[PDB]
Symmetry: C3
Subunit: 166 residues, 3 copies
């Protein structure tokens, strides 16, 4: 309730199971995807998220978004189309993503429900050889910093174990 | 201490082996399970990465310790045991993960019937970019699910970063 | 803090630099060493013979920020490797040379009255690289970070911009 939680972790780290546990007592759930239980309703959406995360949401309806990483990828390919990603203007693309993330953050601030955002840690390997992967890793890292600063709580999930770091 | 299962995880060359050794420094005898010359005399080494209940047994003394290095290599050994030298693009990774699940279940059950302190070393491999190779992508997912299962069974879990152990369970 | 060594580690674009700035925000003077910003900082570009910059003469109320260990490692590999195919390189000899340079750095920090903050990267929690140079870089960088953390008074892991004190 009037709370924003960010859950981050690596691939198959258990971060989705952890986020579901955070909201398991909510009478109802809105799942934003970028077979679910009966008291869940699902929406597929990765842009203009203030149209779903609104001041009219029932205060007892938890909102779970999975996941920020795929939102970023979807925005990049929406802007890039079918063109060769080697040629994308990643500076201009990140400005567009910054607008969408700012809409997301402003919407959470005005919504009475608990919002849980799931994201991925993608930056503790080696520098990618592929240009898109290099820029994606940088953009995802900056996006996660911004969301963590806005969040009231931040969990890092490692091998299924939650570590509360904010 | 006795009847204890510890998981130690971390990245490549993160110091997790030195941390694991520190955890069992006081044990009068150690069984070192190498999964594939300078070990102390009170260590015994056994090369094994399947049917581990045959080495991690109820008969082991409670004051001893068992160190397994490492879960990641056990997983890759099982993949290549089932796939051989064939093109890994074609492997049935669902069937291969079921076989790995069988062996990890035997390992967990064996630890829970063993009086020794068992320390399992594993690797975090999931915090980079999605691999562009089919085998690497599936291995990343399998390794992550295996580590979740071991951490849930463990009494203690350490994450070692730049040589520093962080107790997270 | 005077006569202190802090290590700050984390992934790419994890907010390490911002966290390190916060650690030294109360220093009246800062030396920034770039191995590849507030106006009062003075900058140097250096990744070798770091005892010429990190000296006993520095005042104890000052701070030194070095960014970053990872690039000093890769610069040394590329400098020592030369223009032959890196599949063929003597990585054992290269690591001995890198160890020598890290020893110079650690010793210089221990004779310096300033608070020295070293920024480095975690590069070891992905999949084993398919390239020999990248595999050896990953292993050397991991060992270097272990050595720096052991010598440091304080160690921070920065995740998604959030600093976690682990030593």
């Amino acid at each position: 309730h009037h709370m924003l939680t960010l859950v981050t972790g690596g691939a198959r780290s258990g971060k989705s199971r952890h986020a579901e546990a955070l909201i398991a007592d909510a009478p109802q759930v809105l799942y934003i995807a970028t077979g679910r239980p009966a008291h869940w309703r699902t929406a597929e959406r990765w842009q203009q998220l203030d149209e779903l995360i609104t001041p009219a949401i029932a205060p007892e309806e938890a909102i779970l978004l999975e996941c920020i990483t795929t939102m970023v990828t979807n925005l990049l390919f929406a802007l890039g189309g079918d063109s060769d990603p080697d040629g994308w203007d990643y500076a201009a693309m990140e400005r567009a993503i910054d607008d969408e993330i700012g809409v997301l953050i402003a919407a959470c601030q005005r919504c009475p429900a608990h919002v849980v955002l799931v994201t991925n840690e993608v930056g503790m390997g080696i520098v990618p050889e592929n240009r898109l992967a290099r820029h994606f890793r940088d953009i995802a890292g900056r996006v996660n910093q911004r969301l963590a600063a806005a969040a009231d709580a931040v969990w890092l999930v490692v091998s299924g174990i939650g570590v509360k770091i904010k």
